[PDB]
Amino acid sequence: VLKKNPLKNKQVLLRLNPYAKVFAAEKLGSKKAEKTGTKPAAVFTETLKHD
Amino acid sequence: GIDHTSKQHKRSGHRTAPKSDNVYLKLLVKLYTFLARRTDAPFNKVVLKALFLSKINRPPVSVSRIARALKQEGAANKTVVVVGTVTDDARIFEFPKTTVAALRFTAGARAKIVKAGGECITLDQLAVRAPKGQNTLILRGPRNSREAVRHFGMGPHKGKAPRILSTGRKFERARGRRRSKGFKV
RNA sequence: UUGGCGAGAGACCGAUAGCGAACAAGUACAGUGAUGGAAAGAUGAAAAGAACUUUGAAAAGAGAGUGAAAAAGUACGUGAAAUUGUUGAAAGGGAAGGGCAUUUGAUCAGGCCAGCAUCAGUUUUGGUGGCAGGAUAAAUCCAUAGGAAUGUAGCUUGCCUCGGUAAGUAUUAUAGCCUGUGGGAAUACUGCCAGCUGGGACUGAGGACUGCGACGUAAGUCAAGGAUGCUGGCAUAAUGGUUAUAUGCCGCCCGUCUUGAAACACGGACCAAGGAGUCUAACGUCUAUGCGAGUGUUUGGGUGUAAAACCCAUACGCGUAAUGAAAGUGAACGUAGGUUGGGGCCUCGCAAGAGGUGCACAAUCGACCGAUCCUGAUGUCUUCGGAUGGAUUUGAGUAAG
RNA sequence: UUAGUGGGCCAUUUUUGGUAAGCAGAACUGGCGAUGCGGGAUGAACCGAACGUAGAGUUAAGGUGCCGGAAUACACGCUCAU
RNA sequence: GAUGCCCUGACGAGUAGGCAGGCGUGGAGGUCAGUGACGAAGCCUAGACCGUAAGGUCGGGUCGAACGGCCUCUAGUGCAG
RNA sequence: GUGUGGCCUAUCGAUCCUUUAGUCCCUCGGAAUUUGAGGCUAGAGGUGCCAGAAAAGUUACCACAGGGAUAACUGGCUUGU
RNA sequence: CUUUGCUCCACACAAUAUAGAUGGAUACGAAUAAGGCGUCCUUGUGGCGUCGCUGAACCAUAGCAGGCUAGCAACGGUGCACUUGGCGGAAAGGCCUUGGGUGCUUGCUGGCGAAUUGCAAUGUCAUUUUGCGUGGGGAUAAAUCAUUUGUAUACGACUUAG
Numbered sequence A: 001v002l003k004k005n006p007l008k009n010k011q012v013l014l015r016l017n018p019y020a021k022v023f024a025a026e027k028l029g030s031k032k033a034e035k036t037g038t039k040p041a042a043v044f045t046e047t048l049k050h051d
Numbered sequence B: 001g002i003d004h005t006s007k008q009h010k011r012s013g014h015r016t017a018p019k020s021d022n023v024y025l026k027l028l029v030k031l032y033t034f035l036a037r038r039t040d041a042p043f044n045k046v047v048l049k050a051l052f053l054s055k056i057n058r059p060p061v062s063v064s065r066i067a068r069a070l071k072q073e074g075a076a077n078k079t080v081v082v083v084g085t086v087t088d089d090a091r092i093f094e095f096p097k098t099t100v101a102a103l104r105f106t107a108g109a110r111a112k113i114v115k116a117g118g119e120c121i122t123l124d125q126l127a128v129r130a131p132k133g134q135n136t137l138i139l140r141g142p143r144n145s146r147e148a149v150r151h152f153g154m155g156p157h158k159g160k161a162p163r164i165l166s167t168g169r170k171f172e173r174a175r176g177r178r179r180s181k182g183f184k185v
Numbered sequence C: 001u002u003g004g005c006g007a008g009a010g011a012c013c014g015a016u017a018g019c020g021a022a023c024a025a026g027u028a029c030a031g032u033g034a035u036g037g038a039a040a041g042a043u044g045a046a047a048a049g050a051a052c053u054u055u056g057a058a059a060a061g062a063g064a065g066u067g068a069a070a071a072a073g074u075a076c077g078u079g080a081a082a083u084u085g086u087u088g089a090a091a092g093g094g095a096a097g098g099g100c101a102u103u104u105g106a107u108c109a110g111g112c113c114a115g116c117a118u119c120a121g122u123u124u125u126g127g128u129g130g131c132a133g134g135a136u137a138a139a140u141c142c143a144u145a146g147g148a149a150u151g152u153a154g155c156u157u158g159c160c161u162c163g164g165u166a167a168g169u170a171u172u173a174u175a176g177c178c179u180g181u182g183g184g185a186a187u188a189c190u191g192c193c194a195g196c197u198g199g200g201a202c203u204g205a206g207g208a209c210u211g212c213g214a215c216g217u218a219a220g221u222c223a224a225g226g227a228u229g230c231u232g233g234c235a236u237a238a239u240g241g242u243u244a245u246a247u248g249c250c251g252c253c254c255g256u257c258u259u260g261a262a263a264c265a266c267g268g269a270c271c272a273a274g275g276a277g278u279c280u281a282a283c284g285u286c287u288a289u290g291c292g293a294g295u296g297u298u299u300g301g302g303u304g305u306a307a308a309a310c311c312c313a314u315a316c317g318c319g320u321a322a323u324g325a326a327a328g329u330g331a332a333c334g335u336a337g338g339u340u341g342g343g344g345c346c347u348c349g350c351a352a353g354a355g356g357u358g359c360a361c362a363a364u365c366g367a368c369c370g371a372u373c374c375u376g377a378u379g380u381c382u383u384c385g386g387a388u389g390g391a392u393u394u395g396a397g398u399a400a401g
Numbered sequence D: 001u002u003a004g005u006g007g008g009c010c011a012u013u014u015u016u017g018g019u020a021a022g023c024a025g026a027a028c029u030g031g032c033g034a035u036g037c038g039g040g041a042u043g044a045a046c047c048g049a050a051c052g053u054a055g056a057g058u059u060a061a062g063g064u065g066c067c068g069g070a071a072u073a074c075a076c077g078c079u080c081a082u
Numbered sequence E: 001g002a003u004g005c006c007c008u009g010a011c012g013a014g015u016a017g018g019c020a021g022g023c024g025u026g027g028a029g030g031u032c033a034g035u036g037a038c039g040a041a042g043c044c045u046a047g048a049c050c051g052u053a054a055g056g057u058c059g060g061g062u063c064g065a066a067c068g069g070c071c072u073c074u075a076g077u078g079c080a081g
Numbered sequence F: 001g002u003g004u005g006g007c008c009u010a011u012c013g014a015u016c017c018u019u020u021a022g023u024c025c026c027u028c029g030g031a032a033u034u035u036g037a038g039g040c041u042a043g044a045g046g047u048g049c050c051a052g053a054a055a056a057g058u059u060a061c062c063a064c065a066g067g068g069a070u071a072a073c074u075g076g077c078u079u080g081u
Numbered sequence G: 001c002u003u004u005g006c007u008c009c010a011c012a013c014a015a016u017a018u019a020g021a022u023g024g025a026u027a028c029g030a031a032u033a034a035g036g037c038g039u040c041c042u043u044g045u046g047g048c049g050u051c052g053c054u055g056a057a058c059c060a061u062a063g064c065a066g067g068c069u070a071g072c073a074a075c076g077g078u079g080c081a082c083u084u085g086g087c088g089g090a091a092a093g094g095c096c097u098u099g100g101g102u103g104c105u106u107g108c109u110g111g112c113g114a115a116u117u118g119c120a121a122u123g124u125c126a127u128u129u130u131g132c133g134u135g136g137g138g139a140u141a142a143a144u145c146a147u148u149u150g151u152a153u154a155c156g157a158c159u160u161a162g
């Protein structure tokens, strides 16, 4: 009789999507990426700054 | 606004009820609406639609047409069903046994079926015997045999009959109907 | 047999109708004449049609009276509208009228008006948290190499209101800056979160249960298939209706022909009443109904409770055969054909399907009947007969009505 | 099976006659005619958008000194006209 | 009340024109053993109610003899020109 | 092989009537024969307003239905002159 | 000069109806590539200092919509009525000032009251206009018609006289 929006109504969220409980619990919306120390080639930078 | 691809509020263009005010036909329709909804049988949906048809779409079925149908292989003991009137035909001599279900029998048709050992039944008696259309054979009379259809599509080279009251030598056989008088058709 | 005489009737008209004429109507009246030709019905049961008094020259008024009623007085049933008088109410700076909304006044019929909390649906406006990317921002910052000038210190000359300096010189010194290279961050910008919270507005359809979920060890509970809880005032003109007015904004005059009308296009001053797709003969499509290879009782006859209803023989009409100008001839090779589709039914399959049978209907190839053109057997009033077989020919045909 | 119609007109683009025309005549599309609504003061046809009755939100085209709902907003310039 | 009740989804501009469902008028068959001199019909009424509307209903005034609802039939059946 | 007129793209004509060719066939309805007439199939005689009436003017003496679908003023667009 | 009519003032009591009170319209002039305020002196188009960068100010502001009372400290603030003198004609109708009187004082410290309008409802506090009744004062006409004139004139109007 009445369309409830999952994005507002938390109960309806869980009805449609059982994973939402997990996603919220593990804070998958704010996952830290693993640090990497890659550096561009001279050529990449030399062309980027080229007049 | 909406850019409509189709015509809005378009009626289906099929009868959904008999135009007739015949009480008894309305009872038959109350029965077959029930069976068509509550069974899965294709037969009942077909019989229900046939009870809505106008007189011109329910042409009579002669008893010779019924007899011809029962000569089909594997068909001799099927209940023939005619949603309309079964008329007599004195062109046949030997009629088979068989059960015929129909809205109406002419006096002559009812005589001929019964004399051969057969049985004429109403469509409600059919319902009780054969609720899922079991072991039936639906027959339709010929539609395009009406006099009116001779005249549809009249035009040059179409080969249809002119609408004409009096026929004879002097009625529409000259200019336009032969090469000697202008041209043919 | 729309005249005359005498009768009986009606799904007819009801005084602008119905005959022109419901009435002293072919009258009054017009026209030299032929001719033309209206309007005009209704007091009350009964005149009981107002004696008498009074004002007035009188008409009349005012009383009184008659009557069920003079809101029936002959200017007579009812007594609309246009248009008018009086009274009452209201508004009014070059029209009036109208729409939406509310104020004010008047008027009027049958729970009314709100506040907070917790929810749900839709939405608006804030606060704040976590992440991702990019030159793994660029910068700033730190370190370091080099540089110069809008050249800092120092120095050298010249000015010396006696430090104000003007010009050289000098590249960090008693200011700093630029460029390059390293280093470590942060921030912006963009994006993501099934992150968290505050404020505001509109909505509350539905009406036992039934669903999908969530939370709980279960019991159960819940914000989960649409609002409940708690509280106040009033209980009547208070809300609301109506109406008049005021105010904001908006609003050209309808009808018509027209590409185009508010038009400096036409009709319309106003009001009542009347005022225009009808009936018939014969038809097309469609639909309903009866009966059905038939169908149609109603010309007529019989009968009758009398224009009704009821009953009916023989015909006749249309249909059941076509085709041809005509003389004429006249519809099964076959399971009334074959092929391709085809609803439904039948068989087998849990089902999908597969197979069988396939009416209506569609396309196509055949066959049959008539016309046309050929062919021309046996026969024979030797010119009739016309078998058989054909044809890019033709018909408003047959092929279980 | 049957109604109405068989005077059209406008805009963008292509296009003929003509000095040209709110002129005459064609092409394709969209419109007006038959259509209100927001905008263009006003207006058949332009822009936006097509319309059951209401409530809330958001916008189109066009706007935000005052008339008039909405910044006498922010920013870089240009312009002074007896 | 199955022409009923109900569930679900979508849609709604309109001249000429088409079709559908309704409202109203004179008269006819049937019915309500309908209303009425204790007031029928008509007329007046910035009084009330129902219907999107055609219209219907009620109160008050005036009035004086007839008139309505429903199911059908039928037309000389609806006016601003 | 080509040829059903002209290398291709134009060069032409209904109904009624008359007339010719063909079949020597059908009909003249009380029955025959022979003339005559009538039919059937294919042409010709022509309609150029070419889908095809048989057709001279005048009106300032004029009439009617209409037209701003259309001229004779103004006004409007245009501005060749 | 008799319906005791007219007027003003005070006070009630009615109505009236608001283009919209709800602490205060809080006074230089001039310039703006310049000023204001304070201060000093040779009084100037002077020297010195200081302010702005908005009224986000200043003033007022506590008490039953503001009650009833007791003290302290000042002799100040403020309201009302009454007086003194002055100034203001642009539309002055207001500004200032003297004097005494009488209240109030939240400058400071006490005592008593407030309830039930029930958990909000403008919750009524302003301002006009007019009438009406009481008491107190005050004043004691004209115009028009009709008549009349001709400097005037269609009629009104105008101008004259009684």
Ligand SMILES: C[C@@H]1C[C@@H]([C@H](O)CC2CC(=O)NC(=O)C2)C(=O)[C@@H](C)C1
Pocket: F015, F016, F017, F045, F046
């Ligand atoms: C000029 C001449 C006559 C002409 C024709 O017959 C004229 C007829 C046409 C018609 O149908 N009805 C008439 O009354 C006149 C025709 O055929 C031409 C060849 C020869």
Ligand SMILES: [K+]
Pocket: B001
């Ligand atoms: K819509």
Ligand SMILES: [K+]
Pocket: C020
């Ligand atoms: K008459």
Ligand SMILES: [K+]
Pocket: C072, C077
């Ligand atoms: K009367």
Ligand SMILES: [K+]
Pocket: none
């Ligand atoms: K009101």
Ligand SMILES: [K+]
Pocket: C256, C257, C266
């Ligand atoms: K017209």
Ligand SMILES: [K+]
Pocket: none
């Ligand atoms: K005219």
Ligand SMILES: [K+]
Pocket: none
């Ligand atoms: K047509």
Ligand SMILES: [K+]
Pocket: none
């Ligand atoms: K046509």
Ligand SMILES: [K+]
Pocket: D035
């Ligand atoms: K439009």
Ligand SMILES: [K+]
Pocket: none
């Ligand atoms: K517009």
Ligand SMILES: [K+]
Pocket: D060
């Ligand atoms: K848009």
Ligand SMILES: [K+]
Pocket: D067
């Ligand atoms: K203005």
Ligand SMILES: [K+]
Pocket: none
């Ligand atoms: K009746």
Ligand SMILES: [K+]
Pocket: F049
């Ligand atoms: K012609």
Ligand SMILES: [K+]
Pocket: none
């Ligand atoms: K003539």
